[PDB]
């Protein structure tokens with residue numbers, strides 16, 4: 207979670223970045239408000255952006 | 259001496275264990291986090307991993323670390339070894355399997371290292387809290403204030419009475435030991451090791467071989483192979499398969515054991531005090547949430563306890 | 570001109586002073602922090618340090634910084650000079666003992 | 674504060690194992706059948722479902738227990754002592770525990 | 772009870788007989804993963820440290836000051852103290868001499 | 870008074886005569902360290918804001 211989103215890259219000695227104000231929230235799935243994906247638990251259907 | 263602290267760690271090797279987050283996804287990580295100890299006051303945490311720090315193939319060297327790269331153990335100079343919870347953490351010291359770090363609060367603990375162009379990280383979910391000492395909820399150790407006793411993980415590598423067990427490694431599944439060869443599965447055995455195999459093709463076969471063996475099956479998928487190498491021991495990890503029989507081989511001391519220490523706590527600003535008939539008037543201007551307590555000195559204490567967060 | 574802004578800073582040197590969390594433990598740092606000014610609105614802060622930025626023994630050069638190494642002053646080209654509070658801060662400019670940065 | 678000790682699980686391929694009781698604090702043991710675990714080297718077991726993992730766990734005192742612990746006491750009437758500072762006549766102040 | 776002050780109890784800090792009461796329950800391992808997941812009630816010692824409240828050091832009547840080595844209550848202004856002191860006979864001067 | 874609106878007062882913004890009332894107290898330096906620690910009431914102007 208955060209209040210900004212920063213993206214950037216390097217080009218030799220140059221650094222190009224861009225930061226925009228955007229609220230990023232963690233959205234636990236289920237009836238428990240966890241703050242990071244658990245190592246184990248109950249597997250529930252969720253919304254994800256595919257890696258494909 | 260420094261070598262005296264590694265006499266038993268030289269008998270153990272690093273290992274690869276499951277990590278819930280290897281970057282973006284779960285994987286078997288050579289830096290897998292086994293435990294995070296975060297019960298010290300001033301943000302100090304101790305992290306146990308599957309990697310070995312401070313040892314090289316030629317002996318003890320605090321600038322070197324060792325980790326497993328498949329079945330082969332690799333030794334490199336420490337390169338950008340880092341710990342992160344919510345922001346970069348300062349490293350205090352490292353010892354076999356153990357890292358001591360000074361971290362800010364966070365919901366995760368991330369540990370990783372670099373190996374040339376390679377990057378190895380492991381992130382686990384773990385609530386890291388900053389625990390101030392005393393009656394003030396400060397968020398970072400102050401430059402000055404009142405020195406109070408506190409609980410800290412020591413920076414010393416000495417054996418201080420706390421130990422963990424190192425056991426004979428269990429079977430290590432490794433399908434790279436198998437090759438179809440001349441349309442007939444062959445088992446390659448690394449020098450000095452033994453390989454257990456299990457094949458269930460029309461000719462069901464199993465056993466332990468100490469040298470290259472060719473079985474009766476013609477498809478690698480029909481066989482399993484396990485590497486047996488007990489020359490180095492591993493921690494009794496809950497993420498590794500257990501061996502057969504009594505696998506206990508020795509003890510490893512825990513380096514950065516918790517100790518009592520003196521921590522600097524903040525000291526709130528002096529209150530303004532005004533006096534009225536039988537009344538004490540205090541004007542409190544805290545910097546951090548500051549606890550105020552009072553009691554009467556008579557037979558009825560009539561105690562008062564409240565945290566002052568604003569003037 | 571740019572040289573006219575360093576006429577007085579050329580007469581001063583960096584120094585080593587106590588830093589409460591120098592590295593991971595209190596020690597005398599060559600870039601100890603003397604003051605943090607954070608009363609501006611858009612998250613911009615000004616930091617005074619014991620190091621000298623923009624000056625080398627051969628003159629003014631904004632790509633160089635000087636700091637004390639024991640009794641000897643050493644001038645080096647700036648290498649990953651950074652500021653962070655809870656996350657990396659963007660540096661705006663540096664001059665003498667001062668660093669300007671935008672921090673969260 | 675307690676620590677939970679978790680020994681290496683017993684992974685039985687193409688077979689099954691059984692749990693036994695042990696003299697450990699809050700000891701837990703359970704066998705989970707139908708597992709098909711993977712390691713860095715690929716599938717650990719050959720059989721697709723005829724495999725079991727036996728998990729074990731028990732509670733220990735944490736390392737911090739040597740310094741960070743609470744002591745529960747039964748309190749009974751004991752003794753009363755004082756430090757008394759006495760002067761008399763031209764004799765200077767003298768004191769002792771009484 | 773689990774999650775309360777006494778969930779973990781030991782007669783002494785170095786004993787080898789420990790009482791532990793937590794809902795330590797082994798969970799099924801995730802598919803394809805070798806690990807030992809479990810659930811357990813959060814430590815009641817950490818809970819107590821949060822909910823300790825005011826100590827006796829801060830609420831004791833009569834201005835008592837609490838010290839631990841040995842455990843004692845100092846300077847409690849309760850009641851009165853009978854006293855008897857035997858003054859040396861050399862400390863007294865005769866009336867006709869004063 | 871310290872911590873209130875008028876803790877710091879000046880007749881003009883360029884005046885050389887400044888009035889200040891804060892509970893500025895010098896603290897003993899930490900052992901072995903050369904520095905000047907102190908405690909002070911947070912500014913009453915920032916508090917007033």
Ligand SMILES: *[C@@H]1O[C@H](CO)[C@@H](O)[C@H](O)[C@H]1NC(C)=O
Pocket residue numbers: 758766767768
């Ligand atoms: C006894 O009283 C005298 C004078 O009041 C003082 O100097 C001395 O320190 C006292 N002794 C103790 C043990 O407090």
